[PDB]
């Protein structure tokens, strides 16, 4: 796909058999999803964004399907205003910015 | 150009006599820059990210040069930890996401 930016780059992702909408977010280093349950061990962590720091649960080596492209990587779960796919996963689907 | 996402997509922007480093950020609706004293009328605004909201000043029709490309639009100004080029300006340079 080529995705233009007149609207939010929202795509459907598959994670744990769940379908969610997420924002392709080149300004995010990391992928952060709203509160959900994922299996396996996790580490408590903190990350900062525009309005300060939040607490997240860090899940590693999680399979996600983004627009039919399969990635396996780190997913942070916590109180994000929207599901954001960060660069850790955008790189795995071969995503670039072009102009 | 094509910009990969292995690293933060930082680029040089010019606005007035000031050069700045800013993020090409598909996750940001509007452009937001750190402390600067722009001319003309502005409106107060609140924008939300991870961690909550910050107050900014909305300046409209501001000329900006991004990677040699002259552009013109809204620039928000406030205590962002990083300068962000938002979709409002990315569209004007014909920026797309591709994978
Ligand atoms: C939270 C997003 C939905 C929207 N934002 C842009 C977003 O790309 C920020 C942009 C950003 C970038 C750096 C610092 C603060 C904000 N990234 C971000 O929060 O990423 C976090 C997840 O990975 C980590 O890597 C960077 C911060 C962490 S935002 O900064 O809050 C924001 C919101 C509204 C506007 N107009 C402009 C920016």
From Swiss-Prot, chains A, B:
Residue spans crossing the bilayer: none
Active site positions: 25 (for protease activity)
Gene coding for it: gag-pol
Biological role: Aspartyl protease that mediates proteolytic cleavages of Gag and Gag-Pol polyproteins during or shortly after the release of the virion from the plasma membrane. Cleavages take place as an ordered, step-wise cascade to yield mature proteins. This process is called maturation. Displays maximal activity during the budding process just prior to particle release from the cell. Also cleaves Nef and Vif, probably concomitantly with viral structural proteins on maturation of virus particles. Hydrolyzes host EIF4GI and PABP1 in order to shut off the capped cellular mRNA translation.
Position of the signal peptide: none
All copies of domain Peptidase A2, residue ranges: 20-89
Name of this chain's protein: Protease
Organism, scientific name: Human immunodeficiency virus type 1 group M subtype B (isolate ARV2/SF2) (HIV-1)
Annotated stretches, region: Dimerization of protease: 1-5, 49-55, 88-99
Subunit details: Homodimer, whose active site consists of two apposed aspartic acid residues.
């Amino acid at each position: 796909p080529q995705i233009t930016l007149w609207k939010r780059p929202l795509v459907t992702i598959r994670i744990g058999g769940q379908l969610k909408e997420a924002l392709l977010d080149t300004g995010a280093d990391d992928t952060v999803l709203e509160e959900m349950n994922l299996p396996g061990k996790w580490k408590p962590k903190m990350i900062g964004g525009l309005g300060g720091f939040i607490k997240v649960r860090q899940y590693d080596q999680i399979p996600v399907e983004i627009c039919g492209h399969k990635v396996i990587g780190t997913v942070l779960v916590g109180p994000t205003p929207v599901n954001i796919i960060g660069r850790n996963l955008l790189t795995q689907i071969g995503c670039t910015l072009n102009f």
